[PDB]
Amino acid sequence: SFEAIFGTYCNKIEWVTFLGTALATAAHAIMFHDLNKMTTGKMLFYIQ
Amino acid sequence: DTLLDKLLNADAVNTVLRAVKNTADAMERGLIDTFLRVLLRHAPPCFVL
């Protein structure tokens, strides 16, 4: 008798990246290491 | 560090160093204090002496 443990076929994970994805054309990703220190971000606009 | 951490860290350093520095000051002044108080507790007045 035999069991024939054949090749364990370790399926490698498919990688992603945020900027490589198509949502980053709507995003605008900015590192800011005191985001843990902001209250918020509150862009003022002047419209004539 | 996007530089706002750096003042906070060096002020932590300054606070610890000033704590130890004024601590050595307090140790010296407490030595002055208890030395003076021992001389007071071992010094009789002039109308006794």
Chain B environment of A34 (Cβ under 8 Å): 2, 4-5
DSSP at A13: P
**Residue for token pair 């350093």:** B13
Among residues A37, A31, A40, the alpha carbon closest in space to that of B6 is found at A37
Cα B19-B34-B29 angle, rounded to 5 deg: 30
Cα distance between residue A5 and residue A16, in whole Å: 32
Residue type at position A45: F
Q: Is A31:A22 a contact under the CB 8 Å cutoff?
A: no
CA distance A37 to chain B (A): 9
DSSP at A34: T
Nearest CA in chain B to A33: B2
Q: Do A37 and B1 count as a contact with CB atoms less than 8 A apart?
A: no
Q: Do B4 and A34 count as a contact with CB atoms less than 8 A apart?
A: yes
Cα A28-A30-A35 angle, rounded to 5 deg: 130
Chain A environment of B8 (Cβ under 8 Å): none
Torsion sign, CA atoms A27, A29, A32, A36: positive
Cα distance between residue B5 and residue A32, in whole Å: 12
SS3 B1: coil
CA distance A41 to chain B (A): 17
- Can you give the C-alpha Rg of chain A in angstroms? 24
SS3 B21: helix
Experimental method: cryo-EM
Q: Is B1:A33 a contact under the CB 8 Å cutoff?
A: yes
Token pair in block for residue B24: 């050595």
